């Protein structure tokens, strides 16, 4: 069997010590599921 557990992601950019890191993400679909 094969299936997704979880995930994370990141960017290297030194935005500044606490500056506005801001984005959004979603799967459009995991077309195969179940």
């Amino acid at each position: 069997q094969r299936r997704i557990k979880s995930v994370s992601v990141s960017l290297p950019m030194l935005v500044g010590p606490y500056e506005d890191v801001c984005a959004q993400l979603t799967q459009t679909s995991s077309s195969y599921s179940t």
């Binding site: 935005v15 500044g16 010590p17 500056e19």
Partner: protein, 134 residues
């Protein structure tokens, strides 16, 4: 800047930009720099970072697309050029010391010299037709 002594540096992690330098000096101190005789001699001692030299040799041979590997990793600041002057006629001469393949002892930690030296000069004149040829 390749001063051969530490220039000043900081970050203030408050705003998004943070870094500054502060200025200090243009030379490594206490090098003889000049001498004279009261007969009117001078020595315009000029002196340059061998590490700057390495970045230059690197940069220029990478402009030659070659893989660079100076066997001297190790910093020191070295004499480089001088002027001399005609005390009465105002003619003068340039002399230049130049070098490549910096080397260091990978076991004894010792300056292993330069593999190649390059040496150059010119007289120069107040003029009136005579061209100098370096």
């Amino acid at each position: 800047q390749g001063l051969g002594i530490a220039s000043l540096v900081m970050t203030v992690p408050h705003m998004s930009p943070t870094h500054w330098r502060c200025d200090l000096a243009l030379n490594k101190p206490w090098l003889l720099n000049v001498m004279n005789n009261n007969r009117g001699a001078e020595t315009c001692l000029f002196y340059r970072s061998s590490a700057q030299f390495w970045l230059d040799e690197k940069q220029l041979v990478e402009a030659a697309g070659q893989q660079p590997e100076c066997h001297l990793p190790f910093p020191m600041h070295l004499h480089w050029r001088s002027e001399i002057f005609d005390e009465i006629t105002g003619n003068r001469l340039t002399q230049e010391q130049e070098y490549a393949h910096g080397s260091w002892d990978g076991q004894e930690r010792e300056f292993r010299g330069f593999g190649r030296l390059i040496q150059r000069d010119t007289d120069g004149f107040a003029q009136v037709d005579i061209p100098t040829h370096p």
